[PDB]
Structure 1
Amino acid sequence: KVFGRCELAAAMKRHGLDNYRGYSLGNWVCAAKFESNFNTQATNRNTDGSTDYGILQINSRWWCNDGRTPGSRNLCNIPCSALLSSDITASVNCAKKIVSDGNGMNAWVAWRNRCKGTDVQAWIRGCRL
C-alpha cells in the first residue's frame, strides 16, 4: 500500500507516535518519506546482508526474522514480512522499541541525514489530525 502524506500522518498519530519519546509527528512522516516513499511493501538490502522492511525500513539484523540473516536478532518478535502489510501496526509497535533503545531516531540513518535539524512540521502541513 502506498499512503498519502497526511493519511500516513493520521495513521501514525492513531497508533501512538506523535511525540512518542519526544519525537513529534513530522519526524516520523519525514522518516517514512525518505525510507520507503510511504510504501508499505518497500524492501532494500543493506551492505551487511540484512534487509530493510516496510514503511520505516526496519531491519533484520536486530529487529525481525526474515529467514536469511545469519547472526542476527529478532528483537520485535516478528517475521519481517509482517512489516510489509497495508496495516502499519507492526511497524509502528516495533519502531517504538527501536526508538526507545538509547539512540532515539538516529537508528534511522535517513532521519539523521535528511530530517534531523530541519523543519519537520512541514511534513504534516495541511493535514487533518
Structure 2
Amino acid sequence: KVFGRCELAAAMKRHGLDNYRGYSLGNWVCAAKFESNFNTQATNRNTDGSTDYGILQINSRWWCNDGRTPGSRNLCNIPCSALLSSDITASVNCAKKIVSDGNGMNAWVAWRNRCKGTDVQAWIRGCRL
C-alpha cells in the first residue's frame, strides 16, 4: 500500500507513536517519507547482505527473520515479510522496540540526515488528527 501523508499520520497516531519516547508524530512521518516514500512494500538491500523492509525500512540484521541474513538476530520476533503488510501494526510495534534501544531515532540514518533539526511538524500540517 502507498499511504497518503495524513492517512499515515492518523494510523501512526492511533498505534501510539505520537510523542512515543518524546518523538512527535512529524518525526515518524518524515522518516517514513524518506525511508520508503510511504510504500509498505519497499525493500532495499544493504552492503552487508541484510535487507530493509517496509514503511520504516527495518533491517534483517537485528530485527526480523528473512531466512537469508547469516549471523543475524530477530529481536522483534517476526518474519520480515510481515513488515510489508498494508496493516502497519507490526512495523509500528517493532519500531517502538528499536527507538527504545538507546539511540532513539538516530537508528534511522535517513531521520538523522533529513529530518533531525528540521521543522518536522510541517509533515502533519493540515491533517485532521
Q: Above 0.5 in TM-score? A: yes
State the Cα RMSD in Å.
Answer: 0.3
Deviation at 1:53, TM superposition (A): 0.1
Using the aligned pairs only, state the percent identity: 100
Deviation at 1:39, TM superposition (A): 0.2
Aligned partner of residue 77 in structure 1, secondary structure = coil
Deviation at 1:127, TM superposition (A): 0.2
Aligned partner of residue 32 in structure 1, secondary structure = helix
1:43-100 per-position Cα deviation (integer Å, ceiling 9, x unaligned): 0001110000000000000000000000100000000000000000000000000000
- C-alpha distance in structure 2 between counterparts of 1:69 and 1:106, whole Å: 23
**Unmatched 5+ residue regions in structure 2?**
none
Aligned partner of residue 90 in structure 1, secondary structure = helix
- C-alpha distance in structure 2 between counterparts of 1:81 and 1:62, whole Å: 15
Task: Say how many residue pairs are matched.
Answer: 129
- C-alpha distance in structure 2 between counterparts of 1:47 and 1:103, whole Å: 22
Deviation at 1:126, TM superposition (A): 0.4
- C-alpha distance in structure 2 between counterparts of 1:121 and 1:51, whole Å: 30
Deviation at 1:118, TM superposition (A): 0.3
Give TM-score, length-normalised by structure 2: 1.00
**Unmatched 5+ residue regions in structure 1?**
none
| Stretches (4+) displaced over 2 A | none
Aligned to 1:29: 29
Deviation at 1:119, TM superposition (A): 0.4
